[PDB]
């Protein structure tokens, strides 16, 4: 499911920020996009860095909840 | 033969599990399993260019989502 | 302007935040906020080496701590 | 604070796999380590990718969690 590299799409904008890292200037091009669709409770997170070479690096993080007793 | 990513489209370097348990103020009890992988792997303006997409997926037993979506593109522009 | 981290040991790349709001079986409602930071930089055996620790804290308002860290040291030993 | 690259340490074991990835043999060394010390609860994650050049990327996750009514 390389998929996330492409349900009503509720949102979208695109801000511009100039930063300054621990060293010289970046522009930075903010999409920021929120969609929808189709006793536990999923909150799946991912983080996808790629580059000018094509290598992507993802960091997933799921956190799983169920409701035990009370 | 312990792990074989060699059929997927990435490859898993990593992983890690906890459990957190909640009572919450109705001494109501919730366990929060956590997993934590790291993959590296999928090799599209390139030069002086990074993609950072940032995603927060939130779902339920019905079938129903919650997508959000950052990209930041990274132009550095001096140094 | 926007952002500066020229001070700092790092360098945030990027940042989200979105809230979760939980009812659970008591009604009781939580919040939870949850912040995503990709950051690179701090630039120690190397060659055909990578390593991917993993923390997983756990705090509360007394200061209590719980860390479970992972280690995962690769060396590639064929391709 | 990168003092991540570094209190009672409750627990701690070192294991051995052999993964094939997406193409060749890497071996992998697993220390895992249980420690401990000092109306919410803050959950923070971080993966800290290093490699033979120094370079370091980490992914924070922070999830807080306060209880509000009921």
Known sequence: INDFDEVTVQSSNTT???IRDASGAVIEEQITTKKM???E???KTFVITTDS???ESIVEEDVLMKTLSD
């Open 41 to 43: 409770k999923m909150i």
């Open 53 to 55: 070479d094509g290598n």
């Open 37 to 39: 669709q189709r006793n």
């Open 16 to 18: 511009d920020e100039i």
